[PDB]
Design a protein around this ligand. Structure first.
Ligand code: B12
Ligand SMILES: C[C@H]1O[C@@H](n2cnc3c(N)ncnc32)[C@H](O)[C@@H]1O
Ligand SMILES: C[C@H]1O[C@@H](n2cnc3c(N)ncnc32)[C@H](O)[C@@H]1O
Ligand SMILES: C[C@H]1O[C@@H](n2cnc3c(N)ncnc32)[C@H](O)[C@@H]1O
Lengths: 252, 453, 453, 453
């Protein structure tokens, strides 16, 4: 009897007549990649394929799930959205996900700290789980660390149906010297928790190119710990302010 | 040139070459999103007919981004052999299609003819090809390159070992490498998409790859797919150089989005010649894929197949060891489902082989596209019959840090044994000495990474 | 046997073997229409796992229709080799899948193991196979039969010449025959679906086919795909007998809908032996295809894959020269789109080869299905790599009287030249002597029906 | 590094690397003329031993002309792969010799190792090789290039058809072409040394060559061995471009004597890519030969072998289709007799192959040298066994306007039939279709230029 979502299923070694079976377990705990499941001729073994399919069915589900509005309120976050009205349209209209709606532009001018040094934006992007799971761990150390021995911190807010280039528009509206976007990545097969940070210095919709952003990817318990991440983000914003540059424009 | 035709008694009129190129495409979500797609099957067919009746000169003289505005247009236009162009300039695209597919057209005939093309012409041919046309046409245009392995010889099939980790953990990377080699994967390259884009970490990942290469005397090359400038810097500081990689896009503005100047690719070639551990003459690696220019706001109203062909025209200038489309890497907004991803993979491979580059394909999809692993298995077999130069390999195709599914190490062994194809001959020799392969087949003790211990 | 499993902590409970078989299928419109499909991707995976854990005996002893009620069930069950059954009866379906795929399992290992199977067990294995499993597994299970040509030898690829006409006009039929032959099509059979089902018209059509066969001494066989009764009477009355055809269904009720008794197929065999112009030992021809039983209201709550596999268990008793599924012949209500049509084709071929029958595929679609000709070209190449014994051929694939699109004569020549496959060896010799083929390739003068005049 | 050794108890002291290189040479008139030769057999052997004990670095860092003073030195030095250099920099020239000759050194081992070399190091290895070392070492270092024919494949042997005339009379040129083709000569190039160096005459001669090429669709390429500038202008003005030729010398001063700048050769490459009728990637053609630099007063006290090796270091930068030494083209003042001409030919070929260039040899002599036609026949067979890429061909070897004797058309047919070698595969197919060759051998009707009429 076996649950394909169980940890026992994930650790299963399927190599038959191995050369050194102890090495196999050593290799198995070295990585989250699906190593050491063996083979049937050149095809995957039955259990390996079943666990793949199981994980896919779960992965697909994470794509359409939305963070409830009540979650964002219980975090004290202002919510605006892009021009996107729903999750299905979100998947097909990246051009609209990169643009704030007309009400979002006004809500930001009305309720957000003007001309901050560092402006923090949160968005579901392609993965709700990457926010709901990591949020409490990364966001307070980040907001606190920017204050401590710090500077003018903008009002953090949540953007529904957001794409990365929408941070250029937020920067222009707010006069932010540095804009920090925490966003969910497209979900992987085995987990949907991976969050990344895209940060840019003094963006301008007209001229900023994508290489002008610095990316910090794979923030989650299996990648860079969310607490640990906030600290590298703080330092990065310090350097962007020092250097007046972001992405490929920073020294080193 | 005609920009109209009558179909079932109705006139189908088009505004310019760029629109005919766009509406001729098989339907895909990206062309709809770009606003350039045909309104209906009828208008698509009418566009194909108008396109089939245009000449090579019609399309060569109408690049989708003007020469004086785009260094990629200039690079493509300036590399034309004008003697080969003059011989074909009055051929209709319909005649060029039939010439490529003819069994009376030899590999050497195409070698000269393709030098008279520009990427827009290459795209034009692909647009009026059925799926079997794209497969058969590509199969009769082999492209062979050599680094420390030879890739592209008809009857062979290579694979990139792609051992990625969420933290660039060198133990996770090694673990995937041993597993991949044990299935015969890695004759194209052992190439890592790094998480941290910094010199010391690239060296660590390169040192890890080359520790395995050096320990078992493997004929192959390593690569870390960071930005090309950080690769150059790491190699100049002593990291082991194998292939030097860069993502490319089909317009100057798209290259700026990536932070790439053409001078950097010139620099990568010179750095490879001064530093890189490569026996053969080819050491660059590019990756491409439909939708990148549209994503960058850099398609200038052209469709994604024409833009992707311009990638191959850019690549050809630098004579790389390998190029591959990353066919469904991005999402449903550019290629929605199975049908569209297969069609684009066949197109991409066909255009890359017609442009004379060493064309492989990362057969892949994402979890927000309407696709599943059976699609990867469908496409990898079709492209293999097309003579695709290599695919990727990961454990069961699950990438734990790029969050998409590619092909398994299993899939390369399956393709090779299904179709009686061999690895690169130098790598096959190595697999034989390791006891992993005999007569193109995995031995009983293969597929077991602990064999290396 | 368990009918339950826990998946991500949730219990999925299944009612009987029949429900498990059904829900384990990849999604297809027919199963939804039949009300037998998984409710979720999760439930579909739970069904596969439950199914993978059942034993050969569990499924052998739970046929979807009871022995006492169904002569097809009895025929399937009575034909089992009980010694081969007893060796594998306690294997899980998971273990049987891995056995079929293993490179240490030889063709002769499977030759004996398959005699211990029943059709429901064959279906079970297919349900837990990915697309590449279905292709690789089928490839390593060749089935070779012989009429006047030999079909199924690995490295060969045959084709039915399908010269149909809306009036059975013998001139239109003859013209399509010369065109087909000129592309190397016809080593499987020259087989005509007649408009009129009468002895005089069948004889007229048969006389037409054999007039061409006899004039150029073609090693092949003709057939008119009328009801088996009118074929038998035409041949008894002196029409030339080649292959004897019948459409089959996987249940007694389904056979009745078609007006077929098993006694007619015993008669076909006896009539073939007395009259038919066949050098080898195989002379029967059957066609199958998913959804047939459900269309007759004769699936008894079983899914269309299990009902299709029971066709092959029936077919195997009569050891036919050829069987093919007509994969998308009916419409979108049973298989909706490319995805489902490719999947069904791979399933049908694999299950046919696992059952030991000479399995081919009519790669086709209808105009009311979400399919196009690029789909047929995808599937025919996939199935060729699986060692599909034959496909159909019509001029460009357009059937002018059955109102559907199959594969073109071009497609067989494409497949053969792409994959370095040859025709049936007897027919290849005739094409060589006709000047149509040299070294597996069409000569310059091939493709021209006027070459026969 | 030592510049001294004791031989039979006597101390031989040498002044610099340059003197060691020179005195280690086998005796030849040019070195005596240059005042650089060993005074005794004993001193010559002491020089070889001193030389054998120096390291790669010792010689890499002491080029016979300084980087700051000579653009050929800079080109040679700037092209080194420093990673490959660093691996071998501490090998002795003795150890490098044994490495090249070893059967455990593969073609791909040498492919990388040679990128760490400079020309002076290449020369050093040759100086401590016996004649059979030079033949065996060169044989195991094949260099393959492709224009419209492929040259250099082991088991093949190509030939330049040299149809020269004292008035550039197109009828005399054409007659020699038909004769050459009739013996299977011309797969390297149909190349004419013109009497007059003017655009109209070059175009006339080129039109003549390409008239024959185009009439019989010959897979080959033409060339007129004028100064590279007039070739470039003729082609820019519309003359058919095949190979672009230039005579080279191993020093900046030597290039000036010839009126060549390196920028012209970069221009030749660019003009070739825009205009020339070449299917493959290689289109340049260079000629070299011992004594050239000393004749220009541009050897700077270096010996003629080291100066010849620097030609190949220059040639390699431009990756030509073919290079050949013109081994005894000049006269007895540089190479006196058979002994010296054979030795020089073996040296030149070996150094060329070690440098990675497509190396052939004009086996020739002058009438004021102590040589005869039996010498050319000795050397061409020796060099064929070394895998020499090509030789020349003239009717019986008599050049009526260059006033020297090369190899006959007969000699290429002799070499091929003696050693079971074939022509360039593309050209061999054309000779087969012309009825001139069957199984590598001249048919009965070959050798007869009237066969083309
Ligand atoms: C999809 C993707 C791409 C796509 C983006 C196109 C698109 N429309 O989605 C393509 C194929 C173009 C791409 C290109 C590159 N990518 Co990328 N990419 C990813 C991936 C797999 C997912 C990103 C995601 O889900 N974003 C979330 C969604 C909601 O955002 P979006 O608005 O739809 O998409 C935007 C971002 O994806 C952004 N983006 C994508 N990649 C990169 C890389 C950098 C440096 C930046 C600043 C932005 C960026 O571009 C999109 C358009 O604005 C990540 C890995 C991961 N697990 O996150 C790598 C990743 C972000 N890419 C990476 C790299 C290195 C690159 C390249 C620089 C490669 C190269 N050698 O040139 C290029 C160029 C980037 C640029 N300056 O434009 C690295 C970043 C490393 C780092 N810390 O700097 C990552 C982490 C993967 C990796 N380790 O290789 N990439
Ligand atoms: C993001 C990573 O995936 C590769 N990649 C994926 N899709 C594309 C595309 N359409 N164009 C270029 N590169 C791509 C990049 O080159 C980088 O390595
Ligand atoms: C109707 C014609 O097509 C064949 N045919 C097409 N589809 C199927 C199917 N699903 N089952 C059985 N026979 C079929 C019939 O046997 C007859 O030849
Ligand atoms: C004079 C003609 O012969 C060739 N040629 C003959 N001998 C030599 C040599 N030693 N060096 C260079 N070129 C030579 C020239 O390049 C020209 O073709």
């Amino acid at each position: 009897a076996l649950d394909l979502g169980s940890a026992e299923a994930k650790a299963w070694i399927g190599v038959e007549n191995p050369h050194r079976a102890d090495v196999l377990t050593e290799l198995r705990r070295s990585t989250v990649a699906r190593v050491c499941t063996g083979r049937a001729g050149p095809r995957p073994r039955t259990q390996a394929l079943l666990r793949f399919l199981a994980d896919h069915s779960r992965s697909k589900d994470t794509v359409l799930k939305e963070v409830p509005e009540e979650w964002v309120k219980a975090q004290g976050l202002l919510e605006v959205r892009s021009e996107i009205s729903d999750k299905n349209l979100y998947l097909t209209r990246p051009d609209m996900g990169r643009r704030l709606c007309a009400e979002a532009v006004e809500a930001l001018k009305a309720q957000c700290v003007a001309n901050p040094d560092v402006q923090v934006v949160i968005s579901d992007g392609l993965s709700t789980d990457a926010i709901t799971v990591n949020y409490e761990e990364i966001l307070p150390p980040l907001m606190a660390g920017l204050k401590q021995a710090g500077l003018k911190v903008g009002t953090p807010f949540f953007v529904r149906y957001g794409r990365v280039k929408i941070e250029d528009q937020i920067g222009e509206i707010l006069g932010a010297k540095v804009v920090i976007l925490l966003v969910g990545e497209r979900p992987g097969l085995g987990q949907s928790e991976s969050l990344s940070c895209y940060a840019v210095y003094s963006p301008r919709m007209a001229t900023t190119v994508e290489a002008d952003r610095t990316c910090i990817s794979n923030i989650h318990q299996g990648g860079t710990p969310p607490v640990e991440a906030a600290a590298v983000i703080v330092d990065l914003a310090k350097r962007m302010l020092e250097q007046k540059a972001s992405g490929i424009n920073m020294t080193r | 040139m005609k920009l109209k035709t009558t179909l079932f008694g109705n006139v189908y009129q088009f505004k310019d070459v760029k629109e005919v190129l766009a509406k001729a495409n098989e339907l895909r979500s990206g062309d709809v999103l770009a606003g350039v797609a045909a309104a209906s099957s009828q208008e698509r067919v009418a566009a194909k007919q108008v396109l089939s009746e245009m000449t090579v000169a019609d399309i060569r003289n109408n690049p989708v981004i003007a020469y004086e505005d785009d260094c990629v247009t200039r690079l493509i236009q300036d590399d034309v052999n004008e003697t080969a162009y003059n011989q074909i300039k009055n051929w209709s695209i319909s005649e060029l299609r039939e010439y490529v597919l003819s069994d009376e057209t030899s590999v050497d005939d195409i070698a000269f003819t393709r030098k008279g093309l520009t990427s827009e012409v290459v795209a034009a041919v692909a647009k009026i090809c059925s799926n079997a046309d794209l497969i058969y046409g590509a199969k009769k245009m082999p492209v062979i390159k050599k680094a420390n392995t030879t890739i592209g010889i008809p009857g062979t099939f290579s694979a990139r070992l792609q051992p990625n980790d969420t933290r660039d953990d060198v133990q996770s990377i090694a673990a995937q490498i041993y597993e991949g080699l044990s299935f015969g994967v890695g004759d194209a390259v052992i190439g890592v998409n790094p998480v941290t884009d910094d010199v010391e970490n690239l060296s660590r990942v390169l040192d890890t790859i080359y520790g395995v290469i050096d320990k078992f005397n493997i004929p192959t090359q390593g690569c870390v797919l960071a930005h090309v400038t950080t690769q150059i810097e790491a190699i100049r500081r002593g990291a082991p150089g194998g292939l030097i990689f860069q993502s490319i896009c089909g317009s100057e503005k798209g290259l700026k989005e990536f932070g790439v100047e053409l001078a950097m690719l010139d620099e990568a070639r010179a750095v490879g010649a001064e530093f890189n551990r490569i026996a053969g003459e080819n050491c660059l690696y590019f990756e491409t894929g439909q939708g990148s220019a549209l994503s960058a706001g850099a398609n200038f109203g052209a469709d994604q197949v024409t833009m992707e062909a311009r990638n191959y025209g850019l690549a050809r200038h630098y004579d790389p060891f390998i190029v591959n489309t990353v066919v469904g890497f991005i999402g449903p907004e550019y290629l929605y489902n199975d049908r569209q991803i297969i069609r684009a993979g066949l197109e991409d491979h066909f255009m890359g082989k017609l442009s004379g580059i060493s064309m492989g394909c990362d057969c892949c999809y994402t979890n927000h596209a309407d696709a599943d692993q059976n699609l990867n298995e469908n496409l990898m077999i079709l492209l293999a019959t097309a003579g695709c130069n290599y695919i990727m390999g990961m454990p069961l195709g699950d990438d734990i840090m790029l969050n998409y599914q590619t092909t398994a190490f299993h899939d390369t062994a399956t393709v090779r044994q299904l179709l009686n194809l061999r690895p690169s001959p130098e790598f096959e020799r190595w697999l034989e000495s390791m006891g992993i392969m005999a007569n193109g087949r995995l031995t009983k003790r293969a597929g077991d990474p602990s064999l290396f211990f």
